[PDB]
Each structure stands twice: as structure tokens, then as C-alpha cells.
């Protein structure tokens, strides 16, 4: 009471925030050691706990006598503070042994500072506002995982326990892979045997022993992290014939489809939120201030011109001389000459700083050393001259000159630092290359690029708050991991770099887990630390939450920002055009209004010059939806020989034969042996190539005897040369291989042959052109980071084969290697790491691999251990350098990738219509009207006799208790189906089998009862009942095969067990929100098959190229090209490409085939494998991903109107509900129905559409009367042609209410909008 008013003065809150920050620092200063060891500093820090606990208790005690209790405790943040202080007090007074779960509450102490800063609370509310629609998606995701886990429980259960054991001596498996006992699986090599029991591949953690292990491994497989290892284990345990059919869908449905759904839902939420009043009002302010500044610039230009004229006329006839000099200076820095000179100087500086490589000549080093001073002086003089000319305030007015000033002062600091201490370089003089961005000014894309930065800078508070909130949650999870696994990772040879001992190590581990790389390995290691696969699995829950709520939180931080700022920029740019042209025309109206004494020709000038700028009305679907949302929100606020060849080419039945020839040639390419070059099959393919190219040249001469043609010429002539050199010895085998590889352009000929495929290709090209500018900016930024990394790390990635030698002159001779418990002599050789930063190209490649996230911890370790220019690594020498990588990850993979996605989303052009002129009044109105236009009044087909028997069955089956019982049977069946496990007791298995028997019998009972309840053909009319029949017959077949004698050794018949697992889809009906979302996205996917064909063609072309080039690499194991992942066959090449597309070790596969590979024994060559892989793998990761990103958006936009519902006038989805309700009354079509039913029908349906409460029913009472009604015909007439029409016509775009007399005009407009429907609606319109 009295204490409240006199203590809530701000310094009290600031003192509490200081205490919280100090407590966070103390929690960060902790150190953990294994086996009970303790640092003295930890003992010193432990004494500070009572002070913090007392201060928190006092701060929470003063609030209780100022807000009461169960209102002080009304706030959730106060509840969290209270539980924190209560657990602290209990821990202080708790001497008992049970405090581990009580000491873990301290990790929530940082969150207290969220409650102390209300801005952080607002930002947290904003970020969590977008995770509510995603929850349903998560449910769907769960439905997927379970649905696959059950399948994984029926095929892979107890398969990873056999292993190659020597001869039963002490149970030491020679290898870490599952084997098979004399089967198409992996046979044991040597004299070992496939014995029973071996923990498993990953300490026995990734398996399908029961439903929990299956769920965990499926979830670990849908994050595209280590799924190929499980695929390979299943391959070598059961044969690789059918395993892909389980894992490719799991990746496709569980990863690509889920990500597409999440992406679409988030984009729809952002679009809906962007048009709220509180955000639109801020955007209008941001636009208004920019517009004011744009005018003020020109007005100061006016003022300065006038001032210099005044000064010139005054002087023409001390202060005057310097003022004239200042004006001349202020005019020599605003000319195009100065712009181009400074840009050329910047470009030369970039070129000279970009030539720095390792082992450069000394002369180049000295030249660059002097050029650095020369360029710094030139830039210093230019900055001083510009500042003197424009003036200090005017110079700092521009946001770009502030960056230049900061870069200049940082460069001076770096120069003096390096002069007083020769050594490392900060890397700030390279940042001057960002000034090269001023090349965009002379282009027509300056406004767009500049408005994005104006939008960004306008939101420094929100982005900082969001970036500090992401760090706050990364610090809370690091502390939790420190409490859980702190000092417990020494259960093996050495502690890993990914540990939780110190705070820097823990936070770096949490960051690495958030990036998703090797998180499953850390999960396995932590589980083993907590102890075995038996009693340590609960700790896995730490890594799931960190993976889930870290995977979509980042996507919620970085996408939203982009989806905001870019969108804002777009609007601003568009506005800056319309606010100009609409003014310019006005000028032409005044230029003619001012002159009446002479016939003005300027009136026609605007008329002929007004339509030149109205042709670029792109208006992507995002902009149209934004406009419609603005309209809805404002409305809601208001309411409150030549001839012969020509004939041959023009023949209608001629493109088809060319197409089939191309397809046959492509298949001939697919079926080839890269390694067994001396094969009869290869000779047959050579013959087919002869005939195939012969027909291609035959269709070329005649096509040219009367861009894409060049392509055809090169693919025809290329094969020609190969034939010319084929009829001789092995002349220029390099050219032979090149011309054979050039043959892969055969499918591309179809691009222009199929109009739809050409259209989708043009859509891809337009999407790339819409983002080329951001692509250029991204490349410039990545080049800057590459130069910085070259300065930081060049020359420091060398090592000696034994770690004792740190110099090259010492790395000579032999050394003792202690491996496999046998010391052996090994050569002592000085080598270099695979990925380094020796020059700018190597740095760019390394940073690209880091951006993909593959193997970036390895390069982080190599960068930390780097010591000097010619020294070997020293562990943990420079930990602070990891900042670099962290910053990199915050920029390119987090920010730039998300702005790429947002830019493609917000600029996606409509392709279905390609025009804005259909009716100009309907976007979803026509979609909702067509739903009632197409579907007839479907009925349930009630019995027409109802005598004694058929009626009884019909009533029983349609009884709601019956469907309740059947859903209960579904639930119990799916509980029993996941209840099996490994090495279960025999009676347990028998009980499970009997439960399956009785459940299948019950389902067959329902299936045969529905037949007599409805009828034979009436039952199979629905597409779902036939599915139930098929699955129940499959279950019957499987149970008969299991019970009665089974197929001894003939074709396998184990797939029938899938049938009983197909009943889960039977319970997917109850997800009314889930079902419609799934159906909508699937239907959108089935509407775009040609983009899928383009993706498949990309995969086909790359697979063929890889087969030809890398096909004959030796299959030696211990490398990335081995018995599991190779280019040997077309299917293997496709699997390798899919593995790279998801991204597992694509850089490792790239390294595994480069120009110096031991080559295959059966191969005819001695040197196989080229440096083409550098291009081959880098382009693919660019292309595939891009196409995928083009596919996802192409689906999302197709459902954008659904993803931006804001359901208050929902019409497309309520028609199905109305049909469901109406089907209860109408027995059949019957032509017309009676009068009394509709009065109750208006209430049977959902009240939201027609009458919300009793009062809106009056409006309904107005709809049935007061206007012309079909009552003119027979009294018993349908009104479904007049009720739902009326509701969907009056709910939005209502104009016949104010007048009520001009009905014929509206009817004519409606009819002419539906002119061709075969005149079926005429009866409905009445």
C-alpha cells in the first residue's frame, strides 16, 4: 500500500535488473568437472547465492503487499518469479539429497529480465502469436511420425542385433554394421559369423525395437540428420531392394511437405497481421516522413542555387573567399565525375585487397602494403573534402556516409594497431567494398534496394529485441545443458569439443544444435553419459525440445523480419511511383488549365504519355491479397526443295515421333554401364546411339533447309565428331569423354516441344530475374567475408601427420603410431586440411559448405586450432575466432536465405490467369459461388421401403453410437498395433495376434453389414468405403497367410501387414481443420505436375552426367564413394543425388572424386574422376534448392486465399457443412421440396452464416420477404436455390439493398459473368 507508491521509482527496477544481470554473469562463470572435482572459484561463487535469493525475496515481498495475491499472482511473470524464489529458498534450506531437480530452476533466472523489460514481453508476445496456427501442423507432423514408426515397427524390428563376431571368443564385433545370415544382406567377410546380439549401430539407440525407439528414430530421420546411416543399416541388414520405398516418402512427406505447410501457414499469418490497423498506421507514418524528406531535398537544392546566385551577384559588383571555395567544393562532390572516380578507386582497392593469397611474392606484399596507405589517404582526403563541402550535419544526414566514416576510423585504428603490433589483421579495410553498392544508383533498381534498407533501419529496435530474445533463450538452454550434462562427457577416450563443461562451450554446443548439424550425435553422446540405452533415454527429451522449438523459432525470427521489411520496401517503392505519376498527370492538367488563349497541345501529351507507364501492372498475388485485406479491414472499421521440307516439318504427326525418339534415346542413356565399358550391352547402346544421332541430324538439315536451335546443333554435331573419331584408335580420349558427356542434352529438347514445360521454365526464369539483384548483394557480402577469412586463416591450415611436430622442417622421417594396439612406423608428412582459406576461391568454397551446414564444426575446429603462418595446430588456441563463424551464421544462412524466400513469396506472379480482367469484382466470391454451381444436392439415399429388415440395418449402421464404437475400435486397434516389441514372451505375442484376429473380424463384420444396410453398388459409390473394403480384405489375406501355412521360399508376401496399418488414415476424418488443410495442399500439388517434371528432369540430367563422369571410381570403403553411395547405376546415382539434395555429406562426396582417385579394377582407364565435381556439386545444390523453393511458393500462393482467411465471412468452406446438414432431409433430387423444412434448416446449419443471435434473424426475416421470391410458382418449391444464393450475395459486395429496384442489371451482370455454364443455373437464379 504505502510502500508501493514510494518504492516503484525507476532506480529500484534498474537496481533489480542489475542484480539479475549479475546473477546471470555468476551463472555463466560456473565450471563443471568430472568425478566430483571442483574449482576453488566455484566455491567462491557458491557463497553469492544467499545475497541473490534475499534480494529476490525482498523484491517479491514488496509486490505482495501492493497487489495482494491470488492480484500480484495474477500475472504469469510474477508466478515465474515466485516459483524461482521459492525453489531458491527451498534449495538454501534443503540439506537433503534431493536437490538436482530443485537446483535446475536457476536456469530460469535469466528469464526474469524479460519480466523486467515490458518491451521484451511485447516482443515475446508478438513472436508467440505466430506459433498458435502452427500447433495443428505439429499435430499433423505427429500423425506422420507415428504412422511411419508403426511401419518401421513391422519391418525393421530386431534387425540390427546380428553382427560379425570372430569365433565367439569375447564378443568383439569386427565391424559396426549389421549383417545377414546367407542372404541378399551384407555377408560376413573372412571367418566371422553373424551371431546374435550386438547393442546396435549408435550405441543401440537408433533402432525399431519398440514404439518409443521407432518414434525417436523416425523423428531423427525427418530432420534430414543422419537418415542415410539408418537407410544403409537397413540395406546391409535386409537388402537394398525395397528400403528406399520406406525412406524416400518419409523424407518427402515428413520433411519437404511439412516444411511447405509451415512456410505457407507462416506467410499467411504474416500477410494477415501486416494489414492490422496498428501496423498500417505505422507504415503510413514511415511513408509520410520519407515523402517529406524527398521534397525537402529538392527545396534545399533550390535554396542553395539561389544563395550561390546571390553571392555571385554580390561579389561580381576573408569570409567571402572561403565561402566561394566552400561552394565550389560543395559542387565538385555532387557531379557524376566525382561519383565515377570514387567508384573506380573503390573497385581498384577491392581488386588489390582481393589478390591476397598464401605464399604470394614479397614484391606483391610490399606493393599492397604501400597501396593500403595510398588508398587510405585518398579516402581520407575524399571524406574531408566532402564533409567540408556539404557540411558536417549534411554529411552525416545520409546513412551511407556514416558507414563510410565508421569504416574510415576503423581502418585508421587497424593501421595504427598493426603498426604498434605487427601480426593479426582485424579485416576492416575490406568493408570499403560495400561502397561499391553505389553502382546500383545508376540503375533502375535503386528505389527498391534503398527502401529495404530504409525499412530495415526503421526497425532497429524490433530486430535488436528479437535478436536479443533469441540469445536469451540460447543462454537459458545452455545453462540447462550445463546443469544436466555438466562434466559428465568423460565416459570415453577423450571429452568431445561439443561439451557442456564451461559456459562458452555449452553455448557454442547449443548454437551448433540449433544449426542442426550433428545434433543426433550429441544426443547419442549425452544419452550414453546419462548411462546406456536403458536408463538414459529421458535425457533425449532435452534435444528434441531444443531441436523443435529451435528449428521453428529461428524460422519465426528471421523469416518474419524479412517478410516484414521486404514487403514494406515493396509497398514504399510502388507508392513512390503512384504518388509521382498521379501528380505528374495533375501537372499536365494545370499546364492546360493555365492556358486558355491558345489551343493547348499538352492536353493530348498526357493522354499519349499516360498509358506508357500503366503497362507494368504486375501486382503479384501478395499485393492483391494485401489490397483485399485492406478493404476488408477498413470495411470492418466502418461498420464497427524448300516446300518439301516445309511440308515435312509442318506435318501434324511429326512432333510425336521426334518426342518418342528423344525419350528412347534418354532411356538408352539411362541404361548404361559406366565401369564395364567392354560389355555387349554397351555395344548395343553404341549401335542405338548411331541410329539415334543419325535421325537427329536428319531432322536438323531439313529443319534448317527452310537459341534452342543452337542447343540442338551442338548436341548433334557433338555426337558427329565422336563418331568421326570413333572409327580409329583411341584418339584424344579426353575429347571422346567430353563428347560422350555432351549427349546428356537430349531431354532438354523437350523444353520447347511441350508448351507447358516451356511455360514452367519461363516461370523459373522470371523468378530468378525477380531476385538477381539480391543475389548480387549476397555475392558481394560473401566475397567480403571470404576476404576477411583469407586474411584471418591463410597458411594456418597445415598439419603434420604426428601432432608432436609443429614445423615443416621437423615433419620429416618416420614416427611411431599407436593404433589397433600395435605400434607401427608411419611416414611423417606435412599435409593440408581439405577445406581451407588459402585464397579467395578456396575461402568462398569453404564458406559455401559452411552455409549449407555440412561439416562446419570441423572447419570451426580447424580455425580455432590455427596458430600461425607456418605452424601446426594447437588445440583451443583461439576460441574467440568462433565469433566469426557465429556472425556468419547469423547473416547468410539465417538472414539472406530468409530474405530470398520472402522476396520470392511476395513477388510471385499469377500464372493461372495471366491477366487482371475477368470480372474485376470477384476473387473468392466466384470461387464460393462455383462450389454451389457445380455440386448437385447430394443426398444420403435413405431407404424407400423401411419394412422390417433393411431399415433395421440402415438405422443401426447410421446410428451415432455405431460410429462412436467404430472409432473406439480404430483407437484400440492402433494402440494394440504399436504395442509389440522385441523378444516379447510367446504368450504376449499370441495375445497380440488374437487381438488382431478379433479386430479384423469386427471390421469385416462392419464391412459386410454396410452392404446389406445400403446395397452392393450403393456401398462402393463412395471412394472411402472401397478403401475400407480393400484394407479389410488385405487384413483377411494377411491373417490367413499368418495362421495357415505360409509361402515357404517363393516370392515374398510380407507387405500385407501394411494393410492393418492403413486404418490410421481412417481416423484422419475427425481432424476437420487438419483434413481440409491436407486436402487443399494435396490438390494444389496435383495441379502443378509440370514443375515436378522439371525437377525430375534436373535429377535425370545430373544423374546421367554423374554416371558418365564419376561412374568408375573405385568402390573402396572408408571414403564417401563406397558400396552404399556411388555413381555405378542410374538408381544409385539418383539416390546419391537425393542424399546430396537433402544434404548429408555432399562436400565429402565432392572430395571423394577429384582427379586423383584410385580407379576401378574392371574399368578400362587408369585415371578416373575429375575436378568437374567442384562445379558439379556446387551448381546442383544451387539449382535443386532453387527449384524446390520455386515449387513450394508455387503451391503456397495457389492456396493463399485459404492461408489468409480471417474467418468472419467464410463462404468456400461452409458450403460443405450446408450440404452435410441438407442431406439429412432430402431423400433424392425430387426436383422440388416442400416449404416447412427450410424454416428449420435456417437453424440446422451453422448460425454464423445467416443469423448469429436472435437479433440477426431479423435480417434473415428480411431476406425471405420484402423482395420477389419464387412463391410465384407452386407453393412447395425449393429455396436452396434462393437461400444460400441470397446469403452469399448479400454477405459481401451488397448493392441491391439500398436500391431494391435494379435487380435486372445485377442479374444480367451475373449471367454475363457465367455466360457459358450450359444454361443450368437459369432455374437456380430464380
Amino acid at each position: 500500500k504505502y510502500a508501493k507508491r514510494i518504492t516503484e521509482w525507476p532506480p529500484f527496477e534498474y537496481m533489480i535488473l542489475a542484480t539479475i544481470i549479475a546473477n546471470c554473469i555468476v551463472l555463466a562463470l560456473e565450471q563443471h568437472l568430472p568425478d566430483g572435482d571442483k574449482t576453488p572459484m566455484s566455491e567462491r561463487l557458491d557463497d553469492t547465492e544467499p545475497y541473490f535469493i534475499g534480494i529476490f525475496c525482498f523484491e517479491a515481498g514488496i509486490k505482495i503487499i501492493a497487489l495482494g495475491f491470488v492480484s500480484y499472482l495474477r500475472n504469469g511473470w510474477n508466478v515465474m518469479d515466485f516459483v524461482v524464489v521459492l525453489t531458491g529458498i527451498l534449495a538454501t534450506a534443503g540439506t537433503d539429497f534431493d536437490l538436482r531437480t530443485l537446483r535446475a530452476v536457476r536456469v530460469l533466472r535469466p528469464l526474469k529480465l524479460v519480466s523486467g523489460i515490458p518491451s521484451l514481453q511485447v516482443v515475446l508476445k508478438s513472436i508467440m502469436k505466430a506459433m498458435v496456427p502452427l500447433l495443428q501442423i505439429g499435430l499433423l507432423l505427429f500423425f506422420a511420425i507415428l504412422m511411419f514408426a508403426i511401419i518401421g515397427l513391422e519391418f525393421y524390428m530386431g534387425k540390427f542385433h546380428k553382427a560379425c563376431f570372430p569365433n565367439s571368443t569375447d564378443a568383439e564385433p569386427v565391424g559396426d554394421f549389421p549383417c545377414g545370415k546367407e542372404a541378399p544382406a551384407r555377408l560376413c567377410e573372412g571367418d566371422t559369423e553373424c551371431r546374435e546380439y550386438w547393442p546396435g549401430p549408435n550405441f543401440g539407440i537408433t533402432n525399431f525395437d519398440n514404439i518409443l525407439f521407432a518414434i525417436l528414430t523416425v523423428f531423427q530421420c525427418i530432420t534430414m540428420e543422419g537418415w542415410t546411416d539408418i537407410l544403409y543399416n537397413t540395406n546391409d541388414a535386409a537388402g537394398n531392394t525395397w528400403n528406399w520405398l520406406y525412406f524416400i516418402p518419409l523424407i518427402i512427406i515428413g520433411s519437404f511437405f511439412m516444411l511447405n505447410l509451415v512456410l505457407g501457414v507462416l506467410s499467411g499469418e504474416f500477410a494477415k497481421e501486416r494489414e492490422r490497423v496498428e501496423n498500417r498506421r505505422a507504415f503510413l507514418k514511415l511513408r509520410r516522413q520519407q515523402q517529406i524528406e524527398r521534397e525537402l531535398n529538392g527545396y534545399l537544392e533550390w535554396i542553395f542555387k539561389a544563395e550561390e546566385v546571390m553571392l555571385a551577384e554580390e561579389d561580381r559588383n576573408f569570409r567571402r573567399k572561403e565561402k566561394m571555395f566552400r561552394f565550389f567544393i560543395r559542387r565538385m562532390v555532387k557531379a557524376q565525375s566525382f561519383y565515377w572516380v570514387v567508384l573506380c578507386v573503390v573497385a581498384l582497392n577491392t581488386l588489390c585487397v582481393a589478390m591476397v593469397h598464401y605464399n604470394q611474392p614479397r614484391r606483391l606484399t610490399t606493393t599492397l602494403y604501400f597501396a593500403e596507405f595510398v588508398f587510405l589517404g585518398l579516402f581520407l582526403t575524399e571524406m574531408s573534402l566532402k564533409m567540408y563541402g556539404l557540411g558536417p550535419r549534411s554529411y552525416f544526414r545520409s546513412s551511407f556516409n556514416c558507414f563510410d566514416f565508421g569504416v574510415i576510423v576503423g581502418s585508421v585504428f587497424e593501421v595504427v594497431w598493426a603498426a604498434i603490433k605487427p601480426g593479426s589483421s582485424f579485416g576492416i579495410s575490406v568493408l570499403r567494398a560495400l561502397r561499391l553498392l553505389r553502382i546500383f544508383k545508376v540503375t533502375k533498381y535503386w528505389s527498391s534496394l534503398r527502401n529495404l534498407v530504409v525499412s530495415l533501419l526503421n526497425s532497429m529496435k524490433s530486430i535488436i529485441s528479437l535478436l536479443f530474445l533469441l540469445f536469451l533463450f540460447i543462454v537459458v538452454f545452455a545453462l540447462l545443458g550445463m546443469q544436466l550434462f555438466g562434466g559428465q562427457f568423460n565416459f570415453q577416450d577423450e571429452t568431445p569439443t561439443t561439451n557442456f563443461d564451461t559456459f562458452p562451450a555449452a553455448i557454442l554446443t547449443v548454437f551448433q544444435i540449433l544449426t542442426g548439424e550433428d545434433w543426433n550425435a550429441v544426443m547419442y553422446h549425452g544419452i550414453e553419459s546419462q548411462g546406456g540405452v536403458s536408463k538414459g533415454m529421458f535425457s533425449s527429451f532435452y534435444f528434441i525440445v531444443l531441436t523443435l522449438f529451435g528449428n521453428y523459432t529461428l524460422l519465426n525470427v528471421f523469416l518474419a523480419i524479412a517478410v516484414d521489411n521486404l514487403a514494406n520496401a515493396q509497398e514504399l517503392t510502388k507508392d513512390e511511383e503512384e504518388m509521382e505519376e498521379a501528380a505528374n498527370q495533375k501537372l499536365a492538367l494545370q499546364k492546360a488549365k493555365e492556358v486558355a488563349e491558345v489551343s493547348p497541345m499538352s492536353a493530348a501529351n498526357i493522354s499519349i504519355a499516360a498509358r506508357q507507364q500503366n503497362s507494368a501492372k504486375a501486382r503479384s498475388v501478395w499485393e492483391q491479397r494485401a489490397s483485399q485485406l485492406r478493404l476488408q479491414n477498413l470495411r470492418a472499421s466502418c461498420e464497427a526443295l524448300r516446300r518439301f521440307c516445309h511440308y515435312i516439318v509442318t506435318m501434324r504427326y511429326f512432333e510425336v515421333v521426334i518426342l518418342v525418339v528423344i525419350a528412347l534415346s534418354s532411356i538408352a542413356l539411362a541404361a548404361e554401364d559406366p565401369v564395364r565399358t567392354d560389355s555387349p550391352r554397351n555395344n548395343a547402346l553404341k549401335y542405338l546411339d548411331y541410329i539415334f544421332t543419325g535421325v537427329f541430324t536428319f531432322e536438323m538439315v531439313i529443319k534448317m533447309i527452310d537459341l534452342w536451335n543452337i542447343l540442338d546443333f551442338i548436341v548433334v554435331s557433338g555426337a558427329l565428331v565422336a563418331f568421326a573419331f570413333s572409327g580409329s584408335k583411341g584418339k584424344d580420349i579426353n575429347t571422346i569423354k567430353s563428347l560422350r558427356v555432351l549427349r546428356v542434352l537430349r531431354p532438354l529438347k523437350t523444353i520447347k516441344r511441350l508448351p507447358k514445360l516451356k511455360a514452367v521454365f519461363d516461370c523459373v526464369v522470371n523468378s530468378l530475374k525477380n531476385v538477381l539483384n539480391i543475389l548480387i548483394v549476397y555475392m558481394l557480402f560473401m566475397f567480403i567475408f571470404a576476404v576477411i577469412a583469407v586474411q584471418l586463416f591463410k597458411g594456418k591450415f597445415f598439419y603434420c601427420t604426428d601432432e608432436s611436430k609443429e614445423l615443416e622442417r621437423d615433419c620429416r622421417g618416420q614416427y611411431l603410431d599407436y593404433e589397433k594396439e600395435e605400434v607401427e612406423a608411419q611416414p611423417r608428412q606435412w599435409k593440408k586440411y581439405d577445406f581451407h582459406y588459402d585464397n579467395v576461391l578456396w575461402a568462398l568454397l569453404t564458406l559455401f559448405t559452411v552455409s549449407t551446414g555440412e561439416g562446419w564444426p570441423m572447419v570451426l575446429k580447424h580455425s580455432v586450432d590455427a596458430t600461425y603462418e607456418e605452424q601446426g595446430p594447437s588445440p583451443g588456441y583461439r576460441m574467440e575466432l568462433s565469433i566469426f563463424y557465429v556472425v556468419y551464421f547469423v547473416v547468410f544462412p539465417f538472414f539472406f536465405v530468409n530474405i530470398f524466400v520472402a522476396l520470392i513469396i511476395i513477388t510471385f506472379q499469377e500464372q493461372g490467369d495471366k491477366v487482371m480482367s475477368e470480372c474485376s469484382l470477384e476473387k473468392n466470391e466466384r470461387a464460393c459461388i462455383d462450389f454451389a454451381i457445380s455440386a448437385k444436392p447430394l443426398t444420403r439415399y435413405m431407404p424407400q421401403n423401411r419394412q422390417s429388415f433393411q431399415y433395421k440395418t440402415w438405422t443401426f449402421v447410421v446410428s451415432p453410437p455405431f460410429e462412436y464404437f467404430i472409432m473406439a475400435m480404430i483407437a484400440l486397434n492402433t494402440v494394440v498395433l504399436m504395442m509389440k516389441f522385441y523378444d516379447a514372451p510367446y504368450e504376449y505375442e499370441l495375445m497380440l495376434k488374437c487381438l488382431n484376429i478379433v479386430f479384423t473380424s469386427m471390421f469385416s463384420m462392419e464391412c459386410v453389414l454396410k452392404i446389406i444396410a445400403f446395397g452392393v453398388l450403393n456401398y462402393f459409390r463412395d471412394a472411402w468405403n472401397v478403401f475400407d473394403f480393400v484394407t479389410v480384405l488385405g487384413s483377411i489375406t494377411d491373417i490367413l497367410v499368418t495362421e495357415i501355412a505360409e509361402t515357404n521360399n517363393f516370392i515374398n508376401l510380407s507387405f500385407l501387414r501394411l494393410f492393418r496399418a492403413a486404418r490410421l488414415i481412417k481416423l484422419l476424418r475427425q481432424g476437420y481443420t487438419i483434413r481440409i488443410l491436407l486436402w487443399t495442399f494435396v490438390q494444389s500439388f496435383k495441379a502443378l505436375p509440370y514443375v515436378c517434371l522439371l525437377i525430375a528432369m534436373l535429377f535425370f540430367i545430373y544423374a546421367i552426367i554423374g554416371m558418365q563422369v564419376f561412374g568408375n571410381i573405385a568402390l573402396d570403403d572408408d571414403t564417401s564413394i563406397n558400396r552404399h553411395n556411388n555413381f555405378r547405376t542410374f538408381l544409385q546415382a539418383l539416390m546419391l543425388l537425393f542424399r546430396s539434395a537433402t544434404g548429408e555429406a555432399w562436400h565429402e562426396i565432392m572430395l571423394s572424386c577429384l582427379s586423383n582417385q584410385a580407379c576401378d579394377e574392371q574399368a578400362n582407364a587408369t585415371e578416373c574422376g575429375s575436378d568437374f565435381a567442384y562445379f558439379y556439386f556446387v551448381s546442383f545444390i544451387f539449382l535443386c534448392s532453387f527449384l524446390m523453393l520455386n515449387l513450394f511458393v508455387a503451391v503456397i500462393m495457389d492456396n493463399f486465399e485459404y492461408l489468409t482467411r480471417d474467418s468472419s465471412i467464410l463462404g468456400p468452406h461452409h458450403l460443405d457443412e450446408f450440404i452435410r446438414v441438407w442431406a439429412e432431409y432430402d431423400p433424392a433430387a425430387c426436383g422440388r421440396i416442400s416449404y416447412n423444412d427450410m424454416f428449420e434448416m435456417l437453424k440446422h446449419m451453422s448460425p454464423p452464416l445467416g443469423l448469429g443471435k436472435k437479433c440477426p434473424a431479423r435480417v434473415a426475416y428480411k431476406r425471405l420477404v420484402r423482395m420477389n421470391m419464387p412463391i410465384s410458382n407452386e407453393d412447395m418449391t425449393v429455396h436452396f436455390t434462393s437461400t444460400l444464393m441470397a446469403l452469399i450475395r448479400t454477405a459481401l459486395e451488397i448493392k441491391l439493398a439500398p436500391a431494391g429496384t435494379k435487380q435486372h442489371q445485377c442479374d444480367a451482370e451475373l449471367r454475363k459473368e457465367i455466360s457459358v455454364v450450359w444454361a443450368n443455373l437459369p432455374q437456380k437464379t430464380l
Partner: peptide
């Protein structure tokens, strides 16, 4: 770092070349 074919731990990142697959560099 560990040479080709040597026994390794995935979470050590101490293979000279390649990754630590199936417990071997």
C-alpha cells in the same frame, strides 16, 4: 589428427581427412 581407417569418435572432429563414419576415420 587421426589417419585413414583409425578408430575415432564422431564428436571429436579429429580425422585428418573425411568424416568419422561408423567409428572409423
Amino acid at each position: 589428427c587421426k589417419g585413414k581407417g583409425a578408430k575415432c569418435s564422431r564428436l571429436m572432429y579429429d580425422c585428418c581427412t573425411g568424416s568419422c563414419r561408423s567409428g572409423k576415420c
